[PDB]
User: Fold DNA ligase from Enterococcus faecalis.
Amino acid sequence: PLTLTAATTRAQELRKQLNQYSHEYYVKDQPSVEDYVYDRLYKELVDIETEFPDLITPDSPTQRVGGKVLSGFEKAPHDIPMYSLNDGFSKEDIFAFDERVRKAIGKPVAYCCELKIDGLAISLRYENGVFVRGATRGDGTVGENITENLRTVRSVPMRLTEPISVEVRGECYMPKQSFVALNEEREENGQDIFANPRNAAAGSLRQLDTKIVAKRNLNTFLYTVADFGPMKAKTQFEALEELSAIGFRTNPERQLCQSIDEVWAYIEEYHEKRSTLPYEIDGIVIKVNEFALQDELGFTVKAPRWAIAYKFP
Ligand SMILES: NC(=O)c1ccc[n+]([C@@H]2O[C@H](COP(=O)(O)O)[C@@H](O)[C@H]2O)c1
Ligand SMILES: NC(=O)c1cnc(OC2CCCC2)nc1N
Assistant:
């Protein structure tokens, strides 16, 4: 037989090994083991959880399939507000942004450049390493609590590597290939298609039945922390490294540019690589890298003064 005692220990072992495999596959996009190895262990875990349902834990990989059905979403306040971004549309707009930054700071300034992921802004809160809240940006100060749905998003860690208390923010999006596939499925079932993957991702995260959301193939890129916790980064480039280090999925295409000249070249570089990417972007986000200089520039009412988004038409 398998006793409750033996199963309690073995279950944790399985959770640890499977989540590590899930990390490599969904977060690093680089699995280490063949699928059949994962499926075999996963099946063993499912058997144990079926026999002893009390052994089911929130960080168990079986829970990714969802199950809960909400009546509605609760309000999710952001005490550290989630701002939006000021826009630029021309090479002149970007150089003018740089001129304003140098005027305010008084010296040449480095920019961390990121692809602008076209999706839904999310905030992920963790207590002692445990996922405890997921939320939409909403209006910047109050969004929707979509914790249950984001449990189904495989790149989102249910328990972090270290027991750290942090809230991080990024983009949840639907990959192109999944957008294509979902719309076909809607065509088959007599449904209106989504106009674009941004809309598909937003309609997905608005679903109240978490079982549907788990089927929707959503993914994430994290790019900032609202509350730092123990985190050590002093620059945006450092933050992105640290975010990867504690277990989040980050976008590999960011670059540290030491002149506005390098910024526009980045912009031209990816303005064309755009088509080759598995996800949609609507532009590029230019951030003053040093956090000390970001604080110095501060925020307007709408947006940070230390950033600008170059939009593609
Ligand atoms: N490390 C791996 O090879 C790995 C990890 C997670 C999921 N998968 C694959 O993804 C598919 C669905 O798995 P999950 O819904 O449990 O994530 C399965 O076919 C599974 O084999 C593979
Ligand atoms: N859509 C994106 O990919 C994206 C959006 N926003 C930001 O930075 C904002 C975060 C709060 C102040 C600057 N970075 C991004 N990469």
